[PDB]
Design a protein around this ligand. Structure first.
Ligand SMILES: C=CCN(Cc1ccccc1C(=O)NCC1CCC1)Cc1ccc2c(c1C(=O)O)OC[C@H](CCC(=O)O)O2
Ligand SMILES: C=CCN(Cc1ccccc1C(=O)NCC1CCC1)Cc1ccc2c(c1C(=O)O)OC[C@H](CCC(=O)O)O2
Ligand SMILES: [Cl-]
Ligand SMILES: [Cl-]
Lengths: 149, 149
């Protein structure tokens, strides 16, 4: 569980927001891209895995699961690439709610930036710092530190 | 010191590599940009502070210290923006050595990607995972978790 992440792709303003969620904590990273491609996904995972100890990624769709570019990045970064089938139905709901939450935050900050990417990074900040009490940022660090010890 | 970061800018292939170093751990994040501008620096800090609890940033030069765009991002993200004067001369040496190390790693991976940005992210990965025995990635998480507790 310390090492398990889930990919998630959502759309706004004719652009794609690619999100990785640390399952156990709810901590996220995100970026705006013109379109989801294998190359964009591969690069995003390479970034993520240099920053956090990513053991397993549940891909967001079959195209990213299939993509040899994505598989190559997962190989490079030592990530187990897995499907994203919601064997637990709770997971669909969790991601749906998360996408709705993020879009709400982006709306709340949208006038504070010209570019969507800026607003998305503001939303990442607010999401990760929000106390639910601990924040997602606190939880991911505690979970991983506990694992290291 | 859990919240103290240092900016560092280095050049390769006619491009700029912007680096943030977590001082106590040596953990890094980095990006390739066409040129250092206040806007590029501001966006980079916004990303960083959404991902780690950034309390203080020692800016890499006087232009980024002065920049009202950089100050705006530091205001937004709750970061204390400070100068980067090496009152401790060991700071110069540490950064210079870090730049040399990163460039060495980039060279070792350079043929594994067409684009410099990919090679830089590979270098970030290798640097953060390298055991020196703990890695910088382990050190940052331990330092921050101890602080939360
Ligand atoms: C078909 C993929 C292209 N490329 C093939 C390649 C080209 C030359 C040498 C080796 C390899 C190779 O297969 N290397 C092993 C893989 C394992 C991790 C690298 C690798 C790559 C992937 C994603 C990227 C890249 C790059 C790049 O070549 O730099 O560049 C930035 C781009 C940014 C996101 C965006 O713009 O979509 O994401
Ligand atoms: C002079 C800065 C331009 N901008 C002014 C602005 C424009 C409209 C509304 C508010 C504000 C405003 O001052 N907001 C408060 C600040 C506090 C954090 C945002 C803000 C900004 C900064 C860096 C960026 C941006 C953007 C943007 O407007 O989206 O866009 C992506 C760009 C990517 C890096 C690159 O390409 O250089 O980094
Ligand atoms: Cl945080
Ligand atoms: Cl790591």
């Amino acid at each position: 569980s310390p090492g398990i992440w889930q990919l998630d792709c959502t759309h706004l303003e004719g652009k794609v927001i690619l999100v990785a969620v640390h399952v156990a904590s709810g901590y996220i990273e995100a970026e705006v891209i013109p379109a989801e491609t294998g190359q964009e996904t591969a690069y995003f995972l390479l970034k993520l895995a240099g920053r956090w100890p990513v053991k397993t990624v549940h891909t967001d769709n079959g195209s990213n699961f299939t993509s040899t570019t994505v598989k190559a990045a997962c190989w490079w970064a030592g990530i187990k690439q897995e499907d994203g089938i919601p064997y637990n139905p709770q997971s669909q709901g969790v991601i749906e709610s998360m996408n709705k939450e993020l879009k709400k935050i982006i709306g709340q900050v949208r006038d504070q930036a010209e570019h969507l990417k800026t607003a998305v990074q503001m939303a990442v900040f607010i999401h990760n710092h929000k106390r639910k009490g601990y924040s997602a940022g606190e939880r991911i660090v505690d979970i991983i530190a506990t694992d290291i010890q």
